[PDB]
Amino acid sequence: SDPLEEYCKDNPETNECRTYDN
């Protein structure tokens, strides 16, 4: 998918995007 998916995977702040809000 777009860099958006890989981000939430690689985002220590937004990879937590699923748990925390950013």
Buried b / exposed e over 9-22, threshold 16 CB at 10 Å, is eeeeeeeeeeeeee
Element holding 8 (H helix, E strand): helix 3-10
Q: Obtained via which technique?
A: NMR
Q: Which tokens is 19 given?
A: 């748990």
Sign of CA dihedral 10, 13, 19, 22: negative
Query: Which among 2, 3, 22, 4 is positioned nearest to 12, based on CA atoms?
Result: 22
